[PDB]
Amino acid sequence: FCGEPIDYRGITAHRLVGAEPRPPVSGTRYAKVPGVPDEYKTGYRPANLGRSDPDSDKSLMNIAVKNLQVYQQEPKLDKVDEFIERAAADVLGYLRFLTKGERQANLNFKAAFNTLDLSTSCGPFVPGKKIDHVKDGVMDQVLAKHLYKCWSVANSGKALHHIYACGLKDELRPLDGKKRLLWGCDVGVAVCAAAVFHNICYKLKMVARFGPIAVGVDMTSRDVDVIINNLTSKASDFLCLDYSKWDSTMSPCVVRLAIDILADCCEQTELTKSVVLTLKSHPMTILDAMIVQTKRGLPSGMPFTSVINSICHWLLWSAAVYKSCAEIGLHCSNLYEDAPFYTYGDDGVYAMTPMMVSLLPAIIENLRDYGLSPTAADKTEFIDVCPLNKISFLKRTFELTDIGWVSKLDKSSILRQLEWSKTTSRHMVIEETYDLAKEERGVQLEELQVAAAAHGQEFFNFVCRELERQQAYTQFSVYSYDAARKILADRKR
Ligand SMILES: [Lu+3]
């Protein structure tokens, strides 16, 4: 469905043909809670500032276009090397051992569709959400027709169309022009992928606290204790990194390899073959009346992105270390066992052997040569190893307590929930909202207390002072400090 080539600002796109256009949703759901004292403000701004951004050109179509160009750049790697190949053998061994050498069964249709949560857009070819098409217990005609075709094609072993609906991720961002894009997955690709991958990922989520793939981990439970015990079992030095533009730069050869590894322990049916073929192909995306191609990156809306991205990370981190050892004449192996690490998409925390610590600059450089842009986890310093009492993972830092280890969401993230509120209406600028008497706002603000309590009584009180004022706007309870601290306590154990 690509007609005539559009030529706008250097993007490879075409006029949408054979499909109805999918105009992206303008504005932001975030609106400012009125009367919030300045001491609780933190800086963040919605990604789509809208007419709050003085640049008149900073329109949604132009912003999406600029961000899509990144995926149209050549990948840093055209093919994988020996060190990545050595890492693949590690993951394969991990999966084969986990699955006891057994392939995981495909799901049949009903099971696969049931995995899809009610609140998901249906992608570029069917409007609205799943919930808008499975109302009175049964699927409407449009969804079923679309799903019947996809399921049929996929079961014949033929690749589906790897196409998404484009948009701007409506999120709060530091006041700094990279913005994440939305990749609304086709509901047909999503169901077939669910059928092929759900069982293996289920098995993976069950065992997430041991890692390396952290997808499924409960940062509120004893998972945290095993993650930390696992990290300190083999080392006393650690590396916490974040990566800039990870999704948008990822090399296809790595993504394809990750998918092949995840699929190797799945049932060998045509549906599997169809899914593997679909997801390995260059994703396309429909902005409005334009269809845009890509040459690199991993859509954040790709079914099972987290697991596959986590495998990519496992591969590149391990390879980076392997390559660095080889350059100093050392053959290194079984990294995930010698130096446990955890991965969750672009988020990683790794144990550091004394040899690894010494190889840090070369490891960082080899990560760069794989196309990655690592940045210190502690968003302020240069990259370096840190002691246990200093590690960072999944926007959390940790503290040894009498109730085991306890994870603390960075205070800024706590505070921003006081300043902003995800409203149910779109806003075209940064503005205040009064539509706050919402059930959701209520549970959010109660949960905020439990998160605040992890930081201590003083911080808790600070937050609770403002929450007490926000009680005029939202029906919700403000617990005592002990009460919230009992909730943390109960969540573990
Ligand atoms: Lu991050």
Swiss-Prot record:
Mn(2+) 1 binds at D242, Y243, D346. Disulfide bonds join C325-C332. Its cofactor is Mn(2+). Residues 236-360 form the RdRp catalytic domain. It comes from the Viruses. Mn(2+) 2 binds at D242, D346, D347. It catalyses: RNA(n) + a ribonucleoside 5'-triphosphate = RNA(n+1) + diphosphate. Replicates genomic and antigenomic RNA by recognizing replications specific signals. Also transcribes a subgenomic mRNA by initiating RNA synthesis internally on antigenomic RNA. This sgRNA codes for structural proteins. Catalyzes the covalent attachment VPg with viral RNAs. This is RNA-directed RNA polymerase. It comes from Rabbit hemorrhagic disease virus (strain Rabbit/Germany/FRG/1989). The chain holds residues 1256 to 1752 of 2344 of the full protein.
